[PDB]
């Protein structure tokens, strides 16, 4: 009915600072679609094992394990850059951020050392972070040390996106809604395919188009063909 | 023929100033597709009535009314921030800008108080703004006071886009070309769907992903299910 | 399993500088899908004439010639602006850059004077630039004078992208992976269509949405209907 | 107690949803015998939903000093032709208007009924002008 001016205060002040700092990063965008038909089936077969263990298993633990496997081949995506992009710190831990918005705005807790965790341990840790997130009881150690982020915008809606990189990280992916679409198979028959879009932003001062693209193709081959993941897990 | 250097002058200076000011806004992109099969059919039913009343009825009056209804639920999308983004002004009037290009460049008049205007009054005012716009006759009061912008790039071409936010607004949507695509219905049969893409940009210092995504899903439910709009209009 | 700090040095310094200068450009993005079914067929028929002449003929020569044709109608897209964007230099030569990542190296050699070259001459020069490109032997003259850029990300992967404009240029296009998708023909029958995505970025200080979109529609008509190119070539 | 005719105030500035809200409120009070004076007075036009129980057509009695009343019959599925000429399931409802013919002529009641019916047969017609 009438205009109203309000302070930006509290835990809101941090998104202002974080996003302002991201203006120093020249964002390159690269996007793709990934055929999740096989993963959808896989997850349905694994759901009762996870539920029998008291864990909810979404698609995120798969996306995270695949990003970790890709980041081992393209370690420059799990790196940080200094004040005027003069030196690159290759970071060994894959502490991968889960962007969540609470009844308080943006919170980005991370799963620590994804590289040494099984898909099941990741699911476990995701459930612990969601439980604390929704309670507003995430601790400092859950929030610091992030090295890469994924934003599952599709748990709510969307296709493509242009996510903003979280300084001092150099990359972020946004995942869209998994949707059944008509797609051709090998024999050229119109089939039901479970398609998801992915939108990557990368700091183009240090990350070139080919690196993000090859990383993305690798992440994508692991999800399209989850058996590729098996080959090198211990 | 040979290189020719040339002053940017007169009205062309304003887009330079406007777009350069937009560099201060950390843009977040969120996109989606909307199924407009039912709206396309509905617009065909209404076309003859609007025509009898001397109005061209396009899709815009629908997009605008659905945007207004969505903004009632997500009022922070119809708001401004100050230089530092220290304070937010929630703006009560939905003065929704219509980006148009003329030979002197970018011109964004707005429809005042969309929230108390019907789809037919919105179409009338759009028609008035287009005529004036093309004749170079927009008033100062047609141009000032905008609180939110839509850009129908799809009147010319395109699917997705990354629109630039117009300070001091915090969000803008770009609408792509409505195109027929093969999509599944609930029976799981390949049907002819009229699909349109939407691309929202939002000032990420104060707007998080969930807000823009929930707003978008609401706008989109009103357009996919126009019955939804009827429930709360008077 | 330890972090490692490493200087950015050598030809890695140049991408930092270029991409940081690009932060001063307010990027507008505009995207589309192009139906390349006829072109895929056309290239297949020319491929054997190309081989006989000792030339590999990809899609890029077609993309390059159609861009040069559109740039003739929309010369503002082949222009540069100054520091504070007070003067436009319309550049006569179409020196179209081909963004390449080597092992080096974001490197962007260009095809000089595309406006006076046949598709086969463009393919010849592309082959030369690819040969020297992969040997790290591209010369200074191959690298300078660029006026517009295309980035074939789809040689590796992708659908849409957000490419970064290369100062002092005002536009860049990124081309996604050509992929067969079910699409309707005029009869409303589900056909196999070779679809490619294009993502344009343009300096919205001097380039409006209508210009990039009409240019894109023109480029796209030339590729969807390659007969249109025949009419006006000499 | 027999006949009770509360009314919804100023329908012209109310949404379908606010009208539903007021109907529920009036139904609830009506059935507790708790309708207020204000609920009961000021009526300008009346509808009687006979079809909540049964019926097709009816002859409703106008309520002085109003000039018109409509009675709504039971909605039911009847075989009807589409525009192709195929036999379709159609949900058919009858409406019966009574109007004071000293001042309301037949063209007025018919034209009003045709407009009322257009809005219900084609609901998007309501979308056009609601705010
Ligand atoms: C000022 C304005 C936003 C006005 O746009 P508008 O209100 O949608 O209508 P318009 O530009 O007059 O175009 C109307 C026609 O274009 C079409 N059109 C408009 N937007 C469209 C879209 N996103 N996709 C497909 N067709 C579209 C049809 O709606 C209409 O076609 P017919 O009436 O011939 O069936 C726009 O002209 C502009 O970008 N400048
Ligand atoms: C915290 C979290 C990432 C966790 O996501 P998650 O691990 O998928 O868990 P969830 O939300 O409980 O998922 C529940 C259901 O949604 C489904 N789902 C999740 N992501 C999906 C996607 N991209 N597409 C389709 N379905 C999805 C899951 O399959 C699950 O389905 P069932 O209940 O049928 O098994 C998510 O809830 C969230 O907050 N994401 C929002 C991202 C965001 O807000 N980013 C904005 C950008 S800037 O502020
Ligand atoms: C420098 C360059 C832009 C040159 O690209 P180019 O002119 O396509 O040559 P190329 O990369 O050698 O392409 C060779 C093959 O890739 C294919 N290809 C290239 N771009 C493609 C796209 N966007 N989608 C699908 N296939 C593509 C060509 O069809 C060609 O296939 P065949 O030889 O099997 O017919 C690129 O190598 C690069 O990104 N760097
Ligand atoms: C108060 C009132 C005038 C109006 O009642 P109302 O607003 O239609 O609600 P109601 O009578 O509770 O309706 C109960 C059910 O009968 C149905 N019904 C009401 N009027 C109908 C009609 N004319 N034809 C067919 N079905 C009807 C409703 O749709 C509702 O359906 P469901 O519960 O199956 O979804 C009437 O109940 C009365 O006689 N007093
Ligand atoms: Cl940028
Ligand atoms: Cl940004
Ligand atoms: Cl910008
Ligand atoms: Cl598609």
UniProtKB/Swiss-Prot annotation, chains A, B, C:
It comes from the Eukaryota. The modification N6-succinyllysine is found at residues 13, 41, 192. Expressed in kidney (at protein level). The modification N6-acetyllysine is found at residues 2, 41, 47, 56, 187, 192. It is found in: Mitochondrion matrix. The active site is at 204, 208. CoA binds at residues 43, 58, 101, 130, 151-152, 155, 176, 178. Forms a 24-polypeptide structural core with octahedral symmetry that represents the E2 component of the branched-chain alpha-ketoacid dehydrogenase (BCKDH) complex. The BCKDH complex is composed of three major building blocks E1, E2 and E3. It is organized around E2, a 24-meric cubic core composed of DBT, to which are associated 6 to 12 copies of E1, and approximately 6 copies of the dehydrogenase E3, a DLD dimer. Belongs to the 2-oxoacid dehydrogenase family. The branched-chain alpha-keto dehydrogenase complex catalyzes the overall conversion of alpha-keto acids to acyl-CoA and CO(2). It contains multiple copies of three enzymatic components: branched-chain alpha-keto acid decarboxylase (E1), lipoamide acyltransferase (E2) and lipoamide dehydrogenase (E3). Within this complex, the catalytic function of this enzyme is to accept, and to transfer to coenzyme A, acyl groups that are generated by the branched-chain alpha-keto acid decarboxylase component. This is Lipoamide acyltransferase component of branched-chain alpha-keto acid dehydrogenase complex, mitochondrial. It comes from Bos taurus (Bovine).
